[PDB]
Design a protein around this nucleic acid. Structure first.
Length: 194
DNA sequence: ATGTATCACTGCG
DNA sequence: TCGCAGTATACA
């Protein structure tokens, strides 16, 4: 959390680092796999180009009561905060100064689970606050495209910080990587509005 | 109403 | 194995 690779271009502003060492990350990830309860059924379908699909991964959301989060036809309410999530949130707040009330958690069982190209833009995502993507497990390729391409390997225990207006000009994705066979759990902390 | 973007898929090179 | 091309409802 002292060594940052800054990513900057017209409309792009992100920062990356390895926040947790190997041991602390293994301990956390081992806790996450036990505690996190992933959504199922209706709560795991999105609507895109006219059709519903199951997401090719698992999703959960946690955060303060009453906040919601919508994208692609689906509204999610947060389950309440569990210690391991509290612990990751607060250590992230500690290095960034920033503060968060909500966390989307995506789990990729292996390298065929993915997330398609999108922007993480939306009204309820508050002004003046970034998005913090933390990762545990397998290492997976993360790509920015400007509708030019920056490819970023997200390592075990890393933190990708995503400031304004990265989200109002560039698309991101976690493409299929067939050669990866291990799980990845990603956490993206946000500061949402009522 | 009526305009606009698409957090997903398959096909194929 | 990867990634470009071409894709009927929301929700605005």
């Amino acid at each position: 959390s002292h060594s940052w690779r800054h990513i900057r271009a017209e409309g792009l502003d992100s920062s990356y680092t390895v926040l947790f060492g190997k041991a602390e990350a293994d301990e956390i990830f081992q806790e996450l796999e036990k505690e996190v309860e992933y959504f199922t059924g209706a709560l795991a379908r999105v609507q895109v180009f006219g059709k519903w699909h199951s997401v090719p991964r698992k999703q959960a959301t946690y955060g303060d009561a009453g906040l919601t989060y919508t994208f692609s036809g689906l509204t999610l309410s947060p389950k309440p905060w569990i210690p391991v999530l509290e612990r990751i949130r607060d250590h992230v707040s500690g290095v960034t100064g920033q503060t968060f009330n909500f966390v989307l958690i995506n789990r990729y069982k292996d390298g065929s689970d993915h997330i398609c190209e999108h922007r993480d833009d939306e009204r309820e995502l508050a002004p003046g606050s970034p998005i913090a993507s933390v990762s545990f497990g397998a290492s997976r390729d993360f790509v920015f495209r400007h509708k030019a391409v920056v490819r970023l390997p997200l390592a075990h225990g890393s933190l990708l910080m995503m400031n304004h207006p990265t989200n109002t000009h560039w698309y991101h994705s976690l493409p299929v990587r067939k050669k990866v066979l291990a799980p990845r759990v990603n956490l993206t902390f946000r500061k949402i509005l009522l």
